[PDB]
Design a protein around this ligand. Structure first.
Ligand SMILES: C=C(/C=C\C[C@@H](O)[C@@H](O)[C@H](O)C/C=C/C=C\[C@@H](O)C[C@@H]1O[C@H](C[C@@H](O)[C@H](O)C[C@H]2O[C@H]([C@H](O)[C@H](O)CC[C@H](O)/C=C/[C@H](C)[C@@H](O)C[C@]3(O)O[C@H](C[C@@H](O)CCCCCCC[C@@]45C[C@@H](C)C[C@@](C)(O4)[C@@H](C[C@@H](C)CCCCC[C@@H](O)[C@H](O)[C@H](O)[C@@H](O)[C@H](O)[C@H]4O[C@H](C[C@H](O)[C@H](O)/C(C)=C/[C@H](O)C[C@@H](C)[C@H](O)C(=O)N/C=C/C(=O)NCCCO)[C@H](O)[C@@H](O)[C@@H]4O)O5)[C@H](O)[C@@H](O)[C@H]3O)C[C@@H](O)[C@@H]2O)[C@@H](O)[C@H](O)[C@H]1O)CC[C@H](O)[C@@H](O)[C@H](O)[C@H](C)C[C@H]1O[C@H](/C=C\[C@@H](O)[C@H](O)C[C@@H]2C[C@@H]3C[C@H](O2)[C@@H](CC[C@H]2O[C@H](CN)C[C@H]2O)O3)[C@@H](O)[C@H](O)[C@H]1O
Ligand SMILES: CCCCCCCC/C=C\CCCCCCCC(=O)OC[C@H](COP(=O)(O)OCC[N+](C)(C)C)OC(=O)CCCCCCC/C=C\CCCCCCCC
Ligand SMILES: CCCCCCCC/C=C\CCCCCCCC(=O)OC[C@H](COP(=O)(O)OCC[N+](C)(C)C)OC(=O)CCCCCCC/C=C\CCCCCCCC
Ligand SMILES: CCCCCCCC/C=C\CCCCCCCC(=O)OC[C@H](COP(=O)(O)OCC[N+](C)(C)C)OC(=O)CCCCCCC/C=C\CCCCCCCC
Ligand SMILES: CCCCCCCC/C=C\CCCCCCCC(=O)OC[C@H](COP(=O)(O)OCC[N+](C)(C)C)OC(=O)CCCCCCC/C=C\CCCCCCCC
Ligand SMILES: CCCCCCCC/C=C\CCCCCCCC(=O)OC[C@H](COP(=O)(O)OCC[N+](C)(C)C)OC(=O)CCCCCCC/C=C\CCCCCCCC
Ligand SMILES: CCCCCCCC/C=C\CCCCCCCC(=O)OC[C@H](COP(=O)(O)OCC[N+](C)(C)C)OC(=O)CCCCCCC/C=C\CCCCCCCC
Ligand SMILES: CC(C)CCC[C@@H](C)[C@H]1CC[C@H]2[C@@H]3CC=C4C[C@@H](O)CC[C@]4(C)[C@H]3CC[C@]12C
Ligand SMILES: CC(C)CCC[C@@H](C)[C@H]1CC[C@H]2[C@@H]3CC=C4C[C@@H](O)CC[C@]4(C)[C@H]3CC[C@]12C
Ligand SMILES: CC(C)CCC[C@@H](C)[C@H]1CC[C@H]2[C@@H]3CC=C4C[C@@H](O)CC[C@]4(C)[C@H]3CC[C@]12C
Ligand SMILES: CC(C)CCC[C@@H](C)[C@H]1CC[C@H]2[C@@H]3CC=C4C[C@@H](O)CC[C@]4(C)[C@H]3CC[C@]12C
Ligand code: NA
Ligand code: NA
Lengths: 294, 49, 244, 49, 40, 294, 40
């Protein structure tokens, strides 16, 4: 048993078989797993062919677009002390990571960045989804447009004295044209004033009726001074056809925030091809919990 | 011995754990989710069948 | 024993390779209860091959039920194939929805984070958390179906070990019942209006059902030849190695 | 007998998957969660019935 | 392909579910018929 | 044209293309014709497998058996002069080729030839169609059995003095059991006398009613003196299982043949699993044209 | 397999011809139906 099963010297066996047997079985398995690997690689190559390089074959899952934000809050809560500096570091590092991509040094020269209307405008079509006219051109987006939340004056962006900012952003979708609501008698209360057709409005409020009073002055910063996204930055042509593309951003300062109390703030974008979902709490709108405990 | 033997015991746990995951949720968070309640309702039905 | 390989390989690549989970808990329970209960019971009822009395008796000392050859056919040869068949349906679902294969290695850490609503795909689009979880679930359902499809083949080849099915014949009624019923279970759970909320299975588009077909035909043809060589050459290499 | 051998093979692989996980930076807890799951997935169920 | 290219973001899941259910019902029926043919 | 199409030195082209092109096309065709050859060889190997080595899968075309003869006559005519020796050489060479296989030297020793009843007997079954009991054993057939047509006494076999012989032979079929007609009231005229059940009768006659008179004495030589084939040499087990197997033969001497006139002689075998065909003039029966012109 | 093994030398060509003709007639009909559907 112990010895005979490990190595016997009459039949010249190791673990149970002889030499020529181990060689035949090992050779068979090597050839077999090679045919298997080759077939899998071929059936996967035909699939890499089938698809196009400038457009995902199916665009029904990412639609309509979401609404993400910086900072990066875990559980959608932004809690920090106004005294301890090591409390809002994880937030500033994120905010900075996001704004660090809009540096003017990056947007330099004629290419591939071109100047666009300083005031909201209409769509801009740079052709079809081809490679004919090379890399398309994207509109520039300056940092300074965001007035008090730019990290250029007060690097912290506000967290230093109980006045935080929230840079909202619309999820990039290929060939998506944003459509704002029209001036007809049916429109929310808020949206009536400053109906710039070319701007997609974003407006934050309180989840509960009580919290209204405890929330102060929501000051939105954006392109042209409006609380929205200019339609001129659309549509998006995809990474392959528009590398070095910048999406608009909207800053929100929650001035006059009550101290030592959890406030639930829900921000929401409005528009025709915009729809919310009771399951996905980031589709079109977003929720943030702020508590400036000091 | 059938419903409470040796392999089914682990499944009995999966069901327990999941139910506790739903309770800490409904007691704490406003407007919770329900993947845990239906997971428990599905697991229990498997040990029973 | 063959279905063990496709259920374990996903948890392995997931942890090692860091990719999105190909098979989950609900889908796995669906495999065990669907393709392993009724088809297995049908096998008991099988008829006798026309060789049963034309073969020598058995020596219990030299011939056992579970020997080193059963694990060779199930785990090694047939299993690895059902695993590749399910991996194809997975890769196909993601590539079409925007996530390609090269970009998938390492996205798990970022994929499984409820907080990154900005996940960027290959074509450069930005995905939220449930929008990408939906595609992952469409992969769990596809895997499932690719398993039932490959099971079709494994079951057919299991009827006989020395004769062909063209010789033995499809006169077993319970086994047929099993093929039609499983197919029905997969179509029902994938298309019913409400499994989404309760079980987490999503509808499958028509071009996907066919991804497992090449791997299902290869298993059948392989076993058929594997047998021709047995019938013609007794005491050869094939009979010493793969005859269980 | 068979069931016994398989269990031996399964317990071995479990401990191995453990060292692999920690050489790759998993949480001490995640390695035991993996050992428990792998040993449960390698042992066949139903054979005697 | 123009601003009103909303079709590129729509899918007829309804018809798909209807067909999938018709097929499931048919396969299941075939099954019962074969399993019980004869009352044994 | 003339020169530019043959060889130009600017684009470095021969017959129309450059070097790298000829290399790519030639390489592609080589690989392609290799995949084609390999697939054809594999699909042909599966077919060589499918079949059995001891038995043709289909035996409906060679049934029932034919009736061939030596000599080798072209158009079924045996015409030769009794004076010119270089007239019947092509015939004798054939007759000799056939009888040269029944030499006693070949049938020597215990194997694989065994002695059988000197008088017609019944069938003999040496087992199934397997390799279990090795090479089967076949009954010996001596030359001398044929009395006046054996090439041992009168090498020419008769053609020398206007008395020819015709060695008839039944086509070898695997697993074919010859079944002669029974003694019931229905049987041809000829067959009544000498009804040895164990002998398959062969009887020649004249095609036309007139030729009867012009045909003399048909003297049949065979095993036991009967005009037939002994059932003991059946069945035939095939080349692989019965190499060195000899089939019975029947000699026919057409004594008293009218000189200088074409005679049509039709020979016919009788039996249950024997059937003739109006299209195949060699199925069960055979026709010979003899004209001993001298 | 015994003297009376005559089956090993017989083939049912009749049934084969009958089936082959049924099939030919069916395929041809399908053809006419498709070619003329509509009177154009
Ligand atoms: C039911 C099951 C059980 C659970 C089910 C579970 O899932 C669920 O029910 C959930 O529970 C639901 C339950 C919910 C319950 C309640 C909830 O409702 C409610 C809510 O829950 C929420 C939580 C929830 O949200 C959570 O998220 C759920 C998840 O939980 C898990 C999480 O991940 C994770 O736990 C998060 C929690 C947290 O993180 C925990 C942290 C630790 C506790 C601890 O660290 C923290 C802390 O420190 O603990 C302290 C207490 C201490 O006393 C403890 C003492 C520590 C002992 C230290 C000794 C360590 C040890 C141990 C030795 C043996 C070996 C050794 C090596 O290590 C040795 C060495 C020594 C020397 C080390 C010394 C270190 C010292 C450390 C200690 O001192 C302490 O740390 C220290 O004291 C600290 O205080 C201090 O701070 C220290 O900090 C630091 C320490 C470090 O951090 C730490 O040390 C580190 C890093 C170590 C690292 O390893 C180091 C490495 C880097 C390494 O060294 C390294 O460098 N390598 C470098 C390599 C290198 O360069 N290489 C270069 C190469 C060059 O060549 C610092 O360093 C130190 O100095 C410092 O001192 O000694 C103390 O408290 C605190 O301190 C505390 O902070 C994960 C899950 O559990 C769960 O999802 C709450 O947030 C919420 O508030 C609440 O409301 C069974 C499971 C199933 O069976 C299985 O299926 C399973 O489900 C799957 C596996 C899941 C997976 O897949 C899922 C998807 C599908 C699956 O389901 C599929 O099903 C999978 C299946 C599985 C199988 C296979 C296949 O696939 C299928 C096939 C089956 C088929 O076949 C069948 C046939 N039979 C048929 C069919 O079934 O089945 C996925 O979804 C899953 O995600 C996935 O996992
Ligand atoms: C929508 C989904 C549709 C699914 C379609 C699946 C189609 C099937 C897939 C592949 C079929 C080819 C497999 C061929 C393998 C070789 C089989 C073989 O070698 O069997 C040998 C047996 C001989 O046995 P024996 O003489 O020892 O029996 C003795 C019996 N005793 C003892 C009573 C005398 O032969 C026999 O039984 C005769 C049986 C002959 C059957 C020929 C089938 C091949 C024709 C077409 C194949 C398809 C080719 C490519 C198709 C792509 C399709 C899109
Ligand atoms: C697009 C490409 C897809 C490729 C995917 C591959 C899928 C799997 C590939 C192949 C599996 C299918 C192969 C079917 C084999 C048919 C063989 C056959 O025909 O052998 C003829 C037999 C023999 O007859 P005998 O009298 O000489 O036997 C005498 C028996 N002795 C001697 C014991 C008395 O005849 C009989 O068995 C009697 C008649 C039985 C007729 C059976 C018909 C049903 C076959 C399959 C059912 C479908 C299951 C799938 C369900 C999903 C649907 C949605
Ligand atoms: C053989 C074993 C293998 C597999 C065994 C699996 C074991 C699983 C055992 C039980 C699982 C129970 C699952 C319960 C089904 C759903 C119940 C439920 O919780 O539904 C909730 C949903 C509400 O969703 P929502 O409001 O969030 O949707 C919002 C949609 N928005 C917003 C897009 C418009 O309800 C709805 O949608 C209304 C739709 C109601 C669905 C009716 C379907 C009936 C379900 C099962 C009956 C089938 C039995 C088979 C009989 C065969 C006879 C031959
Ligand atoms: C999507 C794709 C669908 C279709 C995929 C089809 C894949 C399946 C194709 C082949 C099945 C592979 C089976 C592997 C078995 C080979 C093993 C072997 O090597 O066994 C050789 C035996 C020798 O036995 P022995 O006793 O003398 O050994 C004595 C040994 N000692 C001396 C040590 C004692 O047998 C011999 O040498 C002679 C017998 C040789 C049999 C060759 C059979 C080739 C049949 C088909 C292959 C062609 C497929 C064409 C398709 C084109 C696709 C693009
Ligand atoms: C012994 C064998 C007997 C067999 C006899 C069978 C008799 C025939 C009975 C039914 C045949 C098919 C009936 C077709 C109607 C199906 C209902 C349907 O098409 O619903 C679809 C909609 C779902 O909404 P959506 O797609 O817009 O969601 C949004 C989708 N997203 C999330 C992807 C965007 O429904 C809704 O809204 C409202 C849903 C209301 C409740 C529908 C009930 C469905 C559950 C079970 C019925 C099917 C039983 C089949 C039995 C098979 C045996 C295994
Ligand atoms: C616009 C479309 C309109 C279509 C309407 C179609 C209506 C249906 C009409 C016919 C359906 C099938 C009829 C089945 C009867 C076929 C006759 C048959 O089975 O005969 C077989 C025997 C042959 O003898 P054996 O096999 O024993 O020989 C020995 C064989 N060996 C030599 C191999 C040993 O017959 C004999 O003896 C006697 C034969 C007597 C004459 C039979 C006539 C067959 C010729 C044509 C009729 C088929 C027309 C099909 C039209 C298709 C359109 C393209
Ligand atoms: C055993 C048999 C059937 C396996 C045959 C495997 C075939 C399909 C495999 C073997 C090697 C593979 C090639 C390997 C490398 C490349 C380069 C890549 O840029 C395109 C795909 C391509 C050209 C692959 C196509 C598929 C291929 C030819
Ligand atoms: C194995 C052999 C004999 C039969 C193979 C049957 C296959 C081709 C059948 C089984 C179940 C079928 C699917 C059942 C339901 C649907 C949903 C419908 O909206 C599109 C077709 C689709 C996707 C069917 C395609 C064909 C299908 C996959
Ligand atoms: C391009 C691809 C698909 C072609 C693959 C060709 C395969 C089927 C060919 C290539 C070489 C061939 C082998 C060459 C030699 C022999 C030895 C002979 O005694 C049995 C057949 C066998 C073993 C052949 C089987 C078929 C075979 C393996
Ligand atoms: C190309 C696709 C879509 C259809 C393929 C149809 C093939 C399989 C059809 C066309 C004609 C058919 C043949 C027509 C006639 C006969 C004679 C009959 O006695 C046996 C079946 C047999 C031999 C049929 C077998 C199946 C067959 C070859
Ligand atoms: Na299993
Ligand atoms: Na199981």
């Amino acid at each position: 048993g112990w010895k005979k099963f490990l190595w016997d010297s009459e039949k010249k066996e190791f673990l149970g078989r002889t030499g020529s047997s181990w060689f035949k079985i090992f050779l068979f398995y090597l050839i077999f797993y090679g045919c298997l690997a080759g077939i899998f690689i071929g059936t996967i190559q035909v699939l890499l062919l089938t698809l196009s390089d400038f457009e995902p074959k199916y665009q029904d899952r990412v639609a309509p677009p979401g609404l993400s934000h910086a900072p990066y809050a875990i559980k959608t809560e932004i809690s920090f002390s106004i005294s301890n500096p090591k409390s809002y570091e994880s937030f500033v590092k994120s905010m900075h990571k996001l704004m660090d991509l809009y540096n003017e040094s990056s947007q330099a020269g004629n290419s591939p960045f071109e100047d666009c209307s300083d005031t909201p405008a209409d769509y801009i079509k740079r052709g079809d989804l081809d490679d004919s006219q090379g890399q398309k051109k994207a509109c520039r987006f300056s940092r300074m447009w965001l007035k008090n939340c730019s990290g250029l004056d007060d690097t912290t962006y506000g967290y230093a004295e109980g006045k935080p900012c929230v840079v909202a952003k619309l999820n990039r979708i290929i060939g998506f044209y944003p459509k704002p609501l029209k001036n007809t008698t049916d429109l929310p209360e808020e949206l009536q004033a400053n109906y710039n057709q070319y701007v997609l409005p974003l407006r934050c409020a309180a989840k509960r009726e009580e919290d209204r009073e405890k929330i102060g002055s929501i000051e939105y910063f954006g392109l042209g001074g409006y609380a929205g996204f200019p339609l001129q930055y659309y549509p998006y042509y995809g990474k392959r056809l528009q590398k070095k593309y910048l999406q608009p951003l909207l800053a929100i300062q929650f001035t006059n925030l009550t101290q030592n109390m959890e406030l639930r703030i829900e921000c929401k974008v409005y528009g025709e091809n915009i729809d919310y979902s009771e399951k996905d709490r980031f589709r079109g709108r977003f929720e943030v919990k702020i508590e400036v405990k000091s | 011995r059938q419903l409470f033997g040796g392999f089914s015991i682990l499944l009995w746990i999966g069901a327990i754990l999941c139910f506790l995951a739903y309770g800490i949720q409904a007691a704490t968070e406003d407007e919770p989710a329900n993947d845990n309640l239906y997971l428990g309702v599905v697991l229990s039905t498997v040990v029973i069948v | 024993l063959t279905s063990n390989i496709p259920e374990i390989t996903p948890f392995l690549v997931f942890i090692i390779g860091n990719v999105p989970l190909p098979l989950g808990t609900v889908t796995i329970l669906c495999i065990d209860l669907g393709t392993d209960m009724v088809p297995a019971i049908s096998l008991a009822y099988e008829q006798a091959e026309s060789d049963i009395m034309k073969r020598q008796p058995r020596n219990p000392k030299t011939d056992k039920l579970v020997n080193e050859r059963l694990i060779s056919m199930a785990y090694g040869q047939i299993g690895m194939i059902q695993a590749l068949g399910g991996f194809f349906s997975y890769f196909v679902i993601l590539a079409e929805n925007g996530f390609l294969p090269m970009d998938l290695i390492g996205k798990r850490v970022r994929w499984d984070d409820r907080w990154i609503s900005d996940v960027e795909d290959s074509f450069g689009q930005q995905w939220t958390y449930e929008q990408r979880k939906i595609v992952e679930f469409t992969c769990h359902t596809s895997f499932f179906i690719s398993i039932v499809v490959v099971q079709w083949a494994d079951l057919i080849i299991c009827k006989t070990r020395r004769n062909s099915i063209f010789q033995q014949g499809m006169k077993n009624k319970i086994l047929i019942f099993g093929l039609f019923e499983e197919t029905a279970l997969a179509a029902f759970l994938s298309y019913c209006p409400g499994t989404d909320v309760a079980l987490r299975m999503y509808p499958l588009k028509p071009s996907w059902w066919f991804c497992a077909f090449p791997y299902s035909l290869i298993i059948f043809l392989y076993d058929e030849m594997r047998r021709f060589i047995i019938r013609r050459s007794p005491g050869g290499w094939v009979e010493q190695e793969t005859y269980y | 007998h068979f069931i016994h051998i398989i269990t031996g093979v399964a317990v071995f692989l479990g401990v191995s998957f453990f060292i692999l996980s920690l050489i790759l930076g998993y949480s001490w807890l995640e390695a035991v969660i993996f050992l428990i799951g792998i040993i449960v997935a390698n042992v066949p169920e139903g054979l005697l019935a | 392909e123009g601003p009103d290219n909303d079709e590129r973001f729509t899918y007829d899941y309804y018809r798909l579910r209807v067909v999938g259910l018709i097929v499931a019902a048919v396969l299941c029926v075939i099954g019962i018929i074969i399993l019980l043919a004869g009352k044994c």
